[PDB]
Design an enzyme around this catalytic site. Sequence first.
Site, mmCIF file in Angstrom:
data_model
loop_
_atom_site.group_PDB
_atom_site.id
_atom_site.type_symbol
_atom_site.label_atom_id
_atom_site.label_comp_id
_atom_site.label_asym_id
_atom_site.label_seq_id
_atom_site.Cartn_x
_atom_site.Cartn_y
_atom_site.Cartn_z
ATOM 1 N N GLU A 88 65.693 29.114 55.828
ATOM 2 C CA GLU A 88 64.346 28.837 56.332
ATOM 3 C C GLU A 88 64.149 27.351 56.558
ATOM 4 O O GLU A 88 63.194 26.936 57.324
ATOM 5 C CB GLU A 88 63.258 29.383 55.377
ATOM 6 C CG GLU A 88 63.306 30.947 55.357
ATOM 7 C CD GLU A 88 62.560 31.602 56.473
ATOM 8 O OE1 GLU A 88 61.666 30.930 57.008
ATOM 9 O OE2 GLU A 88 62.801 32.782 56.759
ATOM 10 N N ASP A 97 56.567 27.683 64.653
ATOM 11 C CA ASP A 97 57.819 28.452 64.449
ATOM 12 C C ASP A 97 58.339 28.895 65.831
ATOM 13 O O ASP A 97 57.869 28.393 66.880
ATOM 14 C CB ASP A 97 57.655 29.703 63.526
ATOM 15 C CG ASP A 97 56.690 30.765 64.076
ATOM 16 O OD1 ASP A 97 56.370 30.793 65.289
ATOM 17 O OD2 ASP A 97 56.265 31.669 63.286
#
EC number: 3.2.1.17
Length: 444
Positions: A88, A97
């Site tokens: 991540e 994102d």
Amino acid sequence: MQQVGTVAQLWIYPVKSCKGVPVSEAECTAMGLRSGNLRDRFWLVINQEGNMVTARQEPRLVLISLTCDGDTLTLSAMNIFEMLRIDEGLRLKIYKDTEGYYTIGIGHLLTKSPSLNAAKSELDKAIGRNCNGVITKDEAEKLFNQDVDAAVRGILRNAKLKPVYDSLDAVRRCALINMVFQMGETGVAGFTNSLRMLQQKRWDEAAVNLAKSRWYNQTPNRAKRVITTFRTGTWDAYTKDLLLPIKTPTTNAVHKCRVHGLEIEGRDCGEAAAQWITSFLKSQPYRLVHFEPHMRPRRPHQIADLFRPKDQIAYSDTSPFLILSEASLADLNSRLEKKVKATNFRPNIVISGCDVYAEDSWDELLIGDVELKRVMACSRCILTTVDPDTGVMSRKEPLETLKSYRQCDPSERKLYGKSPLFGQYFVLENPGTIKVGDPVYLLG
Ligand SMILES: Nc1nc2c(c(=O)[nH]1)N[C@H]1C(S)=C(S)[C@@H](COP(=O)(O)O)O[C@H]1N2
Ligand code: MOO
Ligand code: MOO
Ligand code: MOO
Ligand code: MOO
């Protein structure tokens, strides 16, 4: 003559400051517990100057485990938190994102709204302060632990995921949590066929099938790592475990090390161990050494004159043994918001079936054929605040709470000063084996 408790856990911490190894039986030696080739704090990480490296310097040492299987030692450092850190990443400012949604920290989605105001409002609410779109790594780790906890809670309440999760070994459980963290529970619950093959342990077939999904197509490099983890049940896609021999070649160098200011030797365990530890910690060059029994041990009486002149230890702080009761731990836990385990305090022998702090009053114990003699209380430090699962050192719980109610009595303030008491140091009076389930008898 009279039983005051029962042995509930035995723990050996083979490398100083690293993960404990739970055991069901152990020999009690004058230097501490031993289970075959594993002996308590017989291994030490050192820096280039030969000085000890402890969880005070490198709290991530608690993530490293050294275990033994017959022949071979295994060093391993992976768990779900480390796996997701790798997958991540870490960003300390709000970013979008790959689907354009505001996010921060370790993959923490703030909002699906296109409003940066909504993202900042969610960030300030989640952190509890005016962040102005920026957090600290410690705050990112706090959100991360909440997010992983929530993903596992979610799996366990899901009728389609729970039975798969429960059938999976510990490593493959982490691969399923990783998927749920990335794509959410409904999405993962949709892989009906792959979930079936996993529950059936058809690992090659499940790996082939998961590589055909849309998930793989969108993040193939991450999917390939989670897939390898389901295919193999190993950490080969992440920090791969290192396997070393039990016996270190006597051609390896002996280093003069320093532990709590006093000198002690250790035999270097080799370049593979050094590179592996250094890589995982992303640190300056460290080495791993091992104490051999012909080397001069450290002398607890030099550290605290209550210990006997003949006492000896390898790399532990002060004592061959630390003993703690389940009662004392349940007590501290009834005063804490975030619950702690015995693992935070690094005891070797945890005793059940007694009143709170009963161990402070146990001067001489018989356990099996082993006799142990109490020397003094264990006075606590910041190492108790390193979370054993995440490797993150907190802002002093549970130390602060200890501090509030477990200080030593003024009549005694010259050993302990101000540092709260939790656990007792013992030495050996007679060698032998102890087992979980052994009654513990108070002598005299
Ligand atoms: N056998 C033994 N256990 C012990 C101690 C010790 O001196 N000997 N000290 C305790 C304290 S105060 C701390 S901080 C941790 C340190 O663990 P490490 O030596 O593995 O870093 O071990 C705890 N358990
Ligand atoms: O490089 Mo950042 O997005 O401040 O962590
Ligand atoms: O049913 Mo899938 O979505 O082939 O695992
Ligand atoms: O859990 Mo398995 O089928 O031994 O690799
Ligand atoms: O998160 Mo990746 O490197 O797009 O598979």
